[PDB]
From Swiss-Prot:
Changing residue 33 to R: Abolishes kinase activity. There is a cross-link at residue 120 (Glycyl lysine isopeptide (Lys-Gly) (interchain with G-Cter in ubiquitin)). It is found in: Nucleus; Chromosome; Cytoplasm; Cytoplasm, Cytoskeleton, Microtubule organizing center, Centrosome. Interacts (phosphorylated by ATR) with RAD51. Interacts with and phosphorylates CLSPN, an adapter protein that regulates the ATR-dependent phosphorylation of CHEK1. Interacts with BRCA1. Interacts with and phosphorylates CDC25A, CDC25B and CDC25C. Interacts with FBXO6, which regulates CHEK1. Interacts with PPM1D, which regulates CHEK1 through dephosphorylation. Interacts with TIMELESS; DNA damage-dependent. Interacts with FEM1B; activates CHEK1 in response to stress. Interacts with TLK1. Interacts with XPO1 and YWHAZ. Interacts with CDK5RAP3; antagonizes CHEK1. Coiled coil: none annotated. Its EC number is 2.7.11.1. Serine/threonine-protein kinase which is required for checkpoint-mediated cell cycle arrest and activation of DNA repair in response to the presence of DNA damage or unreplicated DNA. May also negatively regulate cell cycle progression during unperturbed cell cycles. This regulation is achieved by a number of mechanisms that together help to preserve the integrity of the genome. Recognizes the substrate consensus sequence [R-X-X-S/T]. Binds to and phosphorylates CDC25A, CDC25B and CDC25C. This is Serine/threonine-protein kinase Chk1. GO terms for cellular component: centrosome; chromatin; condensed nuclear chromosome; cytoplasm; cytosol; extracellular space; intracellular membrane-bounded organelle; nucleoplasm. It is linked to Oocyte/zygote/embryo maturation arrest 21: An autosomal dominant, female infertility disorder characterized by zygote development arrest due to failure of pronuclei fusion. One of its GO terms (molecular function) is ATP binding. The autoinhibitory region (AIR) inhibits the activity of the kinase domain. Phosphorylated by ATR in a RAD17-dependent manner in response to ultraviolet irradiation and inhibition of DNA replication. Phosphorylated by ATM in response to ionizing irradiation.
Amino acid sequence: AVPFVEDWDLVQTLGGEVQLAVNRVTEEAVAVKIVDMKNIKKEICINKMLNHENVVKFYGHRREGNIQYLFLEYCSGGELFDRIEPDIGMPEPDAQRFFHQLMAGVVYLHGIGITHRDIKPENLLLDERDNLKISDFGLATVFRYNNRERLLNKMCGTLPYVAPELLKRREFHAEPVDVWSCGIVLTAMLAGELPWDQPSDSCQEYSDWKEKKTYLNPWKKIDSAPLALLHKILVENPSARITIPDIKKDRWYNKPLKKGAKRPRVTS
Ligand SMILES: CN1[C@@H]2CC[C@H]1C[C@@H](OC(=O)c1c[nH]c3ncccc13)C2
């Protein structure tokens, strides 16, 4: 009925490319990913399965001609990457809260049999209230179907965040790989630096971690409680690595640290 409701104005580049679109009538804002096709089909397929408060919502897609348009939830708070101060990190309570949200989105994805495969702060967006949303399903894949798990063998992700088994073994389970990358995200949030270029024995920093030299750089800035959690996540053997139900029972994970979002108040 309402005439111009279908019209959106592209008002600025978000990050092919991602543009912030504003509805001509309602002024509602959305993110539109523009893909110059000249992959996307699986990405759209995966996005259509997604419905969770900590995952970037998918509204629909349009094909036009050669250009695909994916309409996505707009996250006005930007990337988590931008909340991390170099060499510093961010306050521990904030990092714990973003970590709880990340785990909720991850548990959700794993519950529907989807692995993200590229968890890193650039792909973790923040809404108006600083709620974390996992974004970008371009590298994602189905690891469980009809209740049968399928082992992965494709190498993908981003080196500093990738699990050591991706570099060492021909086949590997999907879930511990996403867990590992969440541990590197946590390290980055608490230390403002990535511990190594890649998790290989040839990598000095990685070999120092395995030798437990936690008096060295990233680790020394941490704090014993979250550092004990990182000792359980960044375990080389994916079979020994802590799983999410267990992360949820971790001492630091459950430590009260942060006050809820402050709400207006007066005195009399
Ligand atoms: C590294 N990338 C850049 C930024 C996040 C990840 C995937 C892609 O953005 C989106 O898909 C966004 C969806 N909703 C958004 N709201 C605000 C900014 C980006 C997006 C491009």
